[PDB]
Every structure is written in C-alpha cells, then in structure tokens.
Design an enzyme around this catalytic site. Structure first.
Site, PDB file in Angstrom:
ATOM      1  N   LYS A 113     -10.081 -13.140  13.388  1.00  0.00           N
ATOM      2  CA  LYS A 113     -10.315 -12.850  14.791  1.00  0.00           C
ATOM      3  C   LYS A 113      -9.245 -11.867  15.279  1.00  0.00           C
ATOM      4  O   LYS A 113      -8.062 -12.175  15.257  1.00  0.00           O
ATOM      5  CB  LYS A 113     -10.320 -14.146  15.625  1.00  0.00           C
ATOM      6  CG  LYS A 113     -11.657 -14.944  15.519  1.00  0.00           C
ATOM      7  CD  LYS A 113     -11.751 -16.175  16.469  1.00  0.00           C
ATOM      8  CE  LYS A 113     -11.246 -17.455  15.802  1.00  0.00           C
ATOM      9  NZ  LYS A 113     -10.868 -18.529  16.773  1.00  0.00           N
ATOM     10  N   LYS A 215     -25.970 -14.624  16.442  1.00  0.00           N
ATOM     11  CA  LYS A 215     -25.676 -16.000  16.914  1.00  0.00           C
ATOM     12  C   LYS A 215     -26.907 -16.706  17.521  1.00  0.00           C
ATOM     13  O   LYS A 215     -27.195 -16.530  18.700  1.00  0.00           O
ATOM     14  CB  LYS A 215     -24.597 -15.977  17.999  1.00  0.00           C
ATOM     15  CG  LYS A 215     -23.177 -16.156  17.541  1.00  0.00           C
ATOM     16  CD  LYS A 215     -22.438 -14.866  17.396  1.00  0.00           C
ATOM     17  CE  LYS A 215     -20.926 -15.080  17.525  1.00  0.00           C
ATOM     18  NZ  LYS A 215     -20.637 -15.718  18.826  1.00  0.00           N
TER      19      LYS A 215
END
Length: 300
Positions: A113, A215
């Site tokens: 991330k 997603k």
C-alpha cells in the site's frame, strides 16, 4: 418452495475501523441453499449498512414472490448474486487461496500500500523489497494519492532495472491523464481501480495500462464482475478480484470467483488477518476462531 434468512453482524477488527459490520443472505429453494455477503465499506461504498439491510430485505421478499430483478446497489447485487449462483451450483467449489501478502512456492508476488504519506517512503520500501528478492513481483496500491510531482518523487527511488517487476501500480494520480503520464515517464505499469466504479468508464487499450482491479462488493453482481473481467481479458489486461474487507464467508467466495474467472491471477484477498474472527465459512490455514450461524443475529 422458497425461503430465506438474513443475518446481521459485526466482527471486531485488529481511530478508524474497530468493527466490520455487515449482513449475510441465505436463499433456500427446495433442498438447495445459497449464501452471499452484503457488507458495504465505509468511505468506499456509496450506500450505508442500514440502507443495505433495507434493500436486501425488500429484494428477498421480491425473490420469494418469483420476480428476479437484482438491485443495482453494489453490495446487495453482489451478495444476492453469490447466493443465487450457489443455489444453482454454478460457482465452483475450487478456489485460489494463494496470497500476495501485504504489509510494509511459485511466482513470488507481494502487495504494498503506497501513497499514505511521503512518496519517498513508498519508493524506498519498494526498491528495498525488489532488490532483496530478485524474482519478486510487486502490486502497488496508490488509491489516487499523488500529484504529478509526488508521482515522480516516488519513482525517484525505484531502480529502473527492477521496474518491470512491478506488475502494476494502481491509480497513482488524481486524474487518469496524470496516471497515464506517470506510466509513460517512469515505464511503470499501471492499473485502474476506483476508475472502474465511476460512471462512464470504458475498457480501452492504453499504453502503460496492464491491469484492472475489480472489487465486487463495490461493483455489484457477479454477472457484472465477470463482464468486466471479460472486457479486460479481451484487451490483454490482468483482472485482479479484490477484497473490500469482507468476512471470511465473502473472502472464500471471492477466492472462488477468482479461480473461476481469473484462474491464473492471484486474487487480492489477504485482508482476513485484519479481523478477530471468521464466520460461517473457514479460510484454509487461518487459526482465527469461527463464529457459527447458531450465534448470528437473525433479522429474517
């Protein structure tokens, strides 16, 4: 003969996010049985938990009456469609439980991330990792964190000669024009993520773009997810099926949707260790305790 059950829950997380709140649907027709998870993600999903509930309960009552429009609300379309696929035995049991581990056997792949603070910190950690593991490939998640400058300041720290082992950097910049520009200047491959869920996204051949991140809890039905996977694969792109921090139940179906739709692509599902328990369905190898359906709050 149709019947249905809805459960409400909250799982404690490892002051942002201290519980994950959500819902399960259990559809039942004759002897067959289908489950699905409806867990919209605060800060990411448009609809709320309680809106999700309302629409889910209402859709279920429709389902019992035989009508079969699905709601276009992402979280509900998603879970409701998983339940529907399990009813018909179409979602195979096979699943991809291989991990691209976060933090910061076969193809070595990891996830970082980025974009959370200084661009410098991210590129440094990225370089370090790729230097130490010569055959490691990295997936980077920016979530549109950078101005063009910071896009440059991050790449400053990554050896050009390792850059081909960054499989993708997702959504580096605030506009898509700038992310494309960053791809070209830096020779680093990019992915779209949040772009896919904005209105009027087109699957288009773009130089520098090599992946899309899908997603499903923020996208909608399993039928729509599939659609997006097929669009990508026609363009030569990698479709990654990813976690919107679903409970173990939704994570195992994401794992299953991966093996089915993106068979050679590790899904981005390493989010279970964020949570303090599993529910209903096990993830293989997790030693987190398992909440039984027995113990779930039942709304229907």
């Amino acid at each position: 003969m149709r019947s249905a059950q809805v459960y409400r829950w909250q799982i404690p997380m490892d002051r942002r996010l201290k519980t994950r709140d959500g819902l399960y649907v259990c559809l039942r027709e004759g002897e067959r049985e289908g489950w699905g998870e409806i867990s919209p993600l605060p800060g990411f999903s448009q609809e709320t938990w309680e809106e999700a509930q309302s629409v889910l309960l209402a859709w279920v009552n429709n389902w019992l009456a035989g009508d079969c429009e699905l709601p276009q609300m992402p979280s509900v379309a998603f879970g409701v469609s998983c339940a529907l696929a399990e009813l018909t035995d179409t979602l195979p049991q096979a699943a991809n439980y291989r991990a691209a581990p976060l933090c910061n056997p076969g193809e070595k792949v990891a996830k970082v991330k980025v974009g959370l603070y200084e661009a410098v910190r991210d590129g440094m950690v990225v370089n370090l990792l790729l230097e130490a593991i010569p055959d490691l490939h990295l997936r980077l998640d920016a979530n549109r964190a950078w101005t063009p400058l910071k896009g440059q300041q991050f790449a400053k720290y990554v050896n050009p000669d390792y850059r081909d082992r960054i499989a993708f950097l997702a959504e580096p910049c605030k506009t898509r024009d700038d992310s494309r520009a960053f791809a070209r200047e830096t020779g680093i491959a990019i992915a779209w993520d949040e772009s896919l869920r904005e209105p009027d996204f087109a699957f288009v051949a773009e130089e520098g773009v090599r992946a899309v991140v899908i997603k499903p809890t923020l996208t909608g039905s399993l039928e729509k997810v599939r659609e997006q996977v097929q669009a990508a694969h026609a363009l030569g792109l990698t479709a990654v099926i990813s976690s919107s921090i679903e409970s173990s139940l939704g994570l195992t179906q994401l794992a299953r949707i991966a093996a089915w739709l993106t068979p050679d692509t590790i899904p981005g599902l390493d989010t279970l260790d964020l949570m303090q328990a599993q529910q209903v369905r096990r993830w293989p190898g997790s030693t987190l305790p398992v909440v039984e359906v027995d113990a779930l709050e039942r709304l229907l």
